[model samples]
Structure formats: structure tokens, C-alpha cells
Target chain A: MIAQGQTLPNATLSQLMVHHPVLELFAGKKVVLFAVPGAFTPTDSEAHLPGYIVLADQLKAKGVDLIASVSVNDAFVMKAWGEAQNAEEILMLADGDASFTKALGLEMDTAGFGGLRSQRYAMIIDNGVVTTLNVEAPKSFEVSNAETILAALEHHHHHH
Target chain B: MIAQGQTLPNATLSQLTKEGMVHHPVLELFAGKKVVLFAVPGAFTPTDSEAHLPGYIVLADQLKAKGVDLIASVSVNDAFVMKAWGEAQNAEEILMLADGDASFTKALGLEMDTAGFGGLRSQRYAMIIDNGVVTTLNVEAPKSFEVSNAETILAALEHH
Candidate 1:
């Protein structure tokens, strides 16, 4: 997995059928990059993403430039999920082939149910370099969640 | 992809169940049933959403009357997206299946690389299955919709 101080890797992601270079999303900006295993699944739809949506403004006020959620599902699926969740504030990004997740070394094998999916994780990127990274354990939903990431940011500010 | 007379391969697809997700084995789903199974590149894509799926929903009864026990639509999407897309399209009668990893598509030798917004995706095709065996397979040409639409498959069922 990418760690703090590592630069963002090379890859592309899509949102609503539009392809975007990974660097472009982070270059010159501070973004919260969160990834879910799949879209519309229980945790992703109801918990993981919803928290981010609800906390979007606060994160923005804290200097987060963009709040983007990435997943292994296709762009169309991500787009539909965002609308269903009313996640207009969060940028719904699709890692259609798991390439970007693999590049980050955070892809998980879901086997029979979902096949290959992204591990639930979050990263704080500052100007294309990782400022903070939190990865969850298998089937575990902690450390990388929205609340914790926000706290992490606040903690960083307190330390400096 | 899978040809006429060959039994379906062993693959576990997914669906939105109760609060999370569930797996559906392909052979079990197709066993002892005459099925019309079609796959599109992605769910909610231009042709697949606008033209491909609508034809099936419109003619579901006609196909069932001609002896098809079930009509299923597959895409390289997760089950949740499939469920929502199905709900959006009013596709209750048809099974909205998700081959989330494209593993099944690759097993069937029917996957293609779509570089821009799409990565690994299934080719648009429809097949007739009888008791787990492919009876008639119609793989469509690239960027064209000729033989995989519901009307085409329905007409093929008429002579059987």
C-alpha cells in the first residue's frame, strides 16, 4: 500500500464514463482519496460513502480540496450509486479494472461474491504526495473511515 | 465465447441479497432450465441501456411464452448496480446479473478491452441455454448492434 511521503502512482480512473488521470486529480490540490470494495454493497452504500457525503463540507472547510470515492465497479455503476446516495458533493471515481487499486497495492480478492475489489482505505494527498494513508484490515471497517480521517487531519494540524 | 452444445462453465456471479450480497452459481442457475442469457459491455451504457435491455423487458412475455424459463442480463458490474439498473429499467422479470470481475466473461472467452472510459468488459451477445448447455450463441460485432438485441433473440426462439 502507498504510505505517507510516497507520491501518487500512475493510473487512470473514470467517473460517469469519463476517464481521468490519477495525477490530475491530486496535482496542486489536497484530496481525500477513499476506496471501497464495491459500489452498492451494504457497507459501501450505507456506511463508507454516506459518511463521506455527510462530512464533505467539514472536510472542505478543513482544507480538503476534493472528496473522491474510488471503487472497482464500472463508471456507470459508480455514477448510479452516487445519485442513489445523493453524493453530489463527493467525486465518484471508478477504477473499472482494478488497475489503480493494484497500483496502490490495495486491491483485495473477494473471490466468489465480488471477485477482485479494492480494500477499504483512505488517503490524504497533498500536491500528489501522500500526507496520510489508512488501510483497513480484512472485512474490517476502521482506521480508514471518514471520521477517523478527519480526526487524523486535525491531529496533524495539532502536531505542527 | 461459449458455443452451442457446450455446458456452461463454473462461475459464481452475485446479486443483492437481504442486507449484503449473495452468490449464484452459473451452472445451478442454468441447470434444467431453458434460459436466454445476454451480456453487455457495461450496465447503463448507451446501446445496452437505451436499446439492448429495453427490448428484453418489452418482449419478456413473448420470449417466456416461446419456452424460455428465464431471461438474464449480465454485465461487468457489481450486483448492486445491476439491481438498481434493473429497478430503473423495470426489469423484474429478467435477472440482472453481475459478473463483477469479468472472470466469467473471460472464462467464456467473450471479454474485450475498451481503452478509454471502459477497461475490461464483456462483448454484447445473447445466447439460448437449455439445461446448462448453450443452444444458440449470437456474439455481436464491435460497436454495432445486430444480433444480440431482444427482438433478434425472440425471433430465434420462434423457430425452436
Candidate 2:
């Protein structure tokens, strides 16, 4: 998996009709990115993407320039899911082929129905470099939630 | 591609309902029935959402009147994504089947490599199946959307 202090790998995530380059999206900005195992899965809809949607403004207020949620799904799926949740604030990015997820080493197989998907994780990226990353273990959640990212950068930046 | 007279390759497709993800075997799906099956590169793509899928939904009754027992759409997307797209298009009459891994696409040798946009998606096509065997197959040319539209399939049903 990509770690703090490492640069995010290059990948193109599809959205709407455009193919968004990963480096371009994270370049010269602070981005809070979280990924789900599958969109519309109970936890994904109930907990994962919704948290980011609900807290998008706070994260931006905390100096995050953008907030996005990605999955190894097609562009259409992401758009509908975002629209379904009224997630106007979050970028619903689709890693169409799992290439980006694999490049990040965050890919996992559901071992049955879902095929390859991104592990539940959130990363804080600033100027194309990963500064803070919280990758949850297995299918569990809680660590990578919005509150954690909020609290991580909640306090003003200080060098002690 | 699964050509005329070939039995559909064995695979497990998924459907999302109130009961949640349900596994459907290929043989059982088309057995003893004459069905209209179609595929789009990925749901929500321009021609797909705009032309391909909507064409079928709009002409569902016409196709049915011509003897299409059911109209099913397959894409290399997870069940949740398929369900959301179905709901978005109000495609309750169509079976929004999920070939999450592209396994079925590959099995039929109709999978296309959409590297940057979407990994390993099915090409645009439509077919008529009778009693688990392909009767009429219409695979589109690359980036082309002519042969598989609802009008074409409906005409094929007329001659059959």
C-alpha cells in the first residue's frame, strides 16, 4: 500500500465522461480520499461514502482542497451512487479496472461475488505526496472514517 | 464471442433485490426460454445510457410483443452498481445482471480491454437465446453502436 511520505502512483480514474489523472487531481492540492470495497454494499452506502459526503465541508475547512471516494467500479456506477446519496460535495471517482488500486497495493478480492476491489482506506495527500494514510484491516471499518481524518488535521499545523 | 448455436458458457451472474445480491447461474437463466440479452461497455457511458440501454427499455413491450421473454443486460460491474443503474434508468423490466469480474465476458470471448476508462468490459452486443443456446448473435464493431440497438434486435425477432 502507498505510505506516508511516498508519492501516489499514476492512474486515470473515470468520472462522468472524463478520465481524471490521479497525479493531476492530487497535484498542488490537499485531497482527502477514501475508498470502499464495493459501492452500494451495506457498509459502503451506510457508513463509508456517506461519512465523506456528510463531512466534506469540514474537511475542506480543515485545509483539504478536495474530497473523493473511489471504487473498482465503472464511471456510471459512481455517478449514480453519488447522486443517490446527494454527494455533490465529493468526487465520485471510478477506478474502472483496478489498475490504480493495484498500483497502490490496496486491492483485495472478495473471493466470490465482487472480484477485485479496493480495501477500505483513507489517505491524506498534499501536493501529490501521501502525508497521512489510514488503511483498515480486512473488511473492518472505523479507523478510516471521516472523524479520524478530521481530528488528524483538526488542530492547526504546528512544528514543535 | 458466443456465436449462434453455442450454449452460454457456465458462469454465475448477480442480481440485486430486496433480498440483496443473488447469484444466478447462466444455464438456469436462459433455459427453456427465448430471451433478449444485451451488453454495454459500461453502464452510464455516453452511448450506453443515452442510446443502448434506453433503447431497450423504451422498446421493451415491442420486443416482448415479438416474443422476447425477458431482456437482460450484462456489464462488468458489481451488483450494487448494476442495481443503482437499473433504478436510475427505471429498468425494472430489464434484468440488470452483474458480471462483476468480467468472467462471463471472457468466457464468451467478447471482453474488451478498456484500459484507461474501465478494465476488461464487455463489448456492445445483443443476442437471442433459446433454451440455453444462442440463436442470433449481434456483436458490434469497435466503438460502433449499430447492430445491437433495440431496433435491430426487434427486427431480428420479427424474422425469427
Candidate 3:
């Protein structure tokens, strides 16, 4: 796992024809970057994504400048999934190659499920530096929930 | 380009999690069942969205009725994107496969360098695999969608 206080890697994420640099998006911004294993998967579609969607405004109210969602799926899938969820407010980022997930040392080998996949994870980034990172255990959805990240953001603000 | 009569290289390709990741050597899918596999540069692109994919979806029943047991669509995008795109296109009959890392594409020497676009994507082509051997191959020229369409493949199959 990428440690706290380390600068986030400048991974290029594609959405349709547009390629976005992670650090460029994070620079000078308080962002919550969350990742899912796959789009349309049971947990992701049922709970993980909806949690962030339901709490997007609240997270923004807590001083988060951007709410970005990352997944190993390509830009098209991410875009469609975002639309299906009506997630216009969140930045649907695609780490199609698993480059960004690997940079964070959170790549999951879901050989049984499909081959290489991203671990379900969420991180609180303040100006490109990770303040708090939460990665869920294999087949577990405990740590990386939006509520946990919201609490972490609140705790971070309280301590700061 | 892998020619007709050349055996396809064994590579891992992922389908939607429901079908799981397929290792190429599992000739069971090709050995007994005649397979019509198509490759696109990327999903949801102009020609691909409007022409390539829709053609296959429209002709899937015909292809199967003509002795093609499996119809697969492959791209460099991941399984999630493939699944979402398949769903959006209502392509329930065609199997959507993901060559995420371009392992299969590079192994087959069909990799294209669209640096500014999605980096390394597969060339547009279609092939008929019978008993793990390439029976017929239709490779599209750059910027041309003539040779790889379903109608072309259907004519080739009829002639065969």
C-alpha cells in the first residue's frame, strides 16, 4: 500500500478520448479517490458505489473538492456505469491497465474471478498527498466504505 | 498478422465475471464448436459503436444458425467495460472478451500504436477458428471497416 504523506503517482486515466493525469487532477485539490474491483459487480453496483453517490454532497460539504472513482475497467464501461448510477457529480476515472492500482500496491489477482483486478480501496488526498488510505481485505467490504472515509476525513480535520 | 492455418497463441482473455476468464488453450470452446472471433480497436468508438458491434449483434443468430457456435468480441479494454458495452448494445448472444494487457493481441502481432488514443489497442479483424486452428482471417486495413464486418464474414463462411 502507498503510505500516507507520499505524493500520488501521475497515472494517466482515459475517459472516452480524453486522457487525464491523476496528479494533475489532484493538484491543489482535496479529493477522495475510491476504487472498485469491477463495474456492475454485485457489491460495487449494490453498495460500494451507491454509498459514495449518496454521500457525494456531504463529502463535498466536508471540503472535498472532487470525488473521483477509479476501477480497472476501461473508460467506456466506467462512463456507462456512472450514467446508470446517475453519478454526474463524481469523476469516473478509468485505470484500464491497472497502472494506477499497481502504483498504489493495491492490485488484486482475482484469478478465480477474472485475472488481474483492482482491490476495493479508497483514499483521501489533500493536494496530491495521501492523508488517509483505506483498502478492503480480500472478499471483504469493510474498510473502504464511504462512511469510513467520511469518518476519516472528519477525524483528519479534527486533528489538523 | 497471424495467417490462416496458423494456430492461435494461447493467451488469457477475460470475459464478464459470470463466464470467468478464459485461458486460450481451452480448445474446448474452439475444438468442438466453430468460433467466430472479432477484434475491435476499442469499444464505443464511432465506427465500432455504430457499425462493427451492431452488425455482430444483428447477425449473431444468423452466425450461430450457420454453424458458428460461439461469437466473441475482443478489445484491449477490460471485462467490465466489455460487459457494460455489451449490455448497452443489448448484445446478450455475443461473448465480450477483454484482452486487458494486450497480451493476446501482442502475441498475435495485431497490436496498433495509437499513442494519443488508448495507447496499444488491437487491430480491427475477424477470424474463424475451427478446432484451435485459424480457418479464415479477415484483417481490416487502417481506417477501413470493409473487411471485418459481419456480412463479409458471413459471405466468407458461406463460401467455405
The parts of candidate 1 lying over 4 Å away from their true place are A156-160, B17-22, B115-118
The global Cα lDDT (0 to 1) of model 3 is 0.82
Which of the predicted structures, 2 or 3, would earn the higher DockQ when compared with the native? 2
lDDT of 3 by residue, A1-160 (tens): 5898899776788776678888887899999988998877778988999999999999998899999898876676678788998989889988766777888888987653444568988999999899888877778888899999888777656765
Evaluated at residue B139, the lDDT of candidate 1 is 96
A68-140: candidate 1 lDDT, tens digit per residue: 9998877877887888899989999988778888888898887645557889989999999898888888889
RMSD (CA, angstroms), candidate 3: 3.4
TM-score of chain B of each: 0.96, 0.97, 0.93
Tens-digit per-residue lDDT, B1-160, candidate 3: 6899988786777775546645554355467778999999987667888899999999988888889989999988767667877888898888888887787888899999765345578999999998778999989999999999999999888884
Better of 1 and 3 by DockQ: 1
C-alpha RMSD between model 1 and the true structure: 2.2
Report per-candidate TM-score of chain A alone: 0.95, 0.95, 0.94
TM-score for each model: 0.91, 0.91, 0.82
Tell me, by DockQ, which candidate is best.
2
Off by over 4 Å in 2: A17-20, A155-160
lDDT for B99 (candidate 2): 89
Task: Tell me the TM-score that candidate 1 gets on chain A alone.
Answer: 0.95
A79 Cα displacement, candidate 3 (Å): 1.1
Stronger candidate by TM-score (1 vs 3): 1
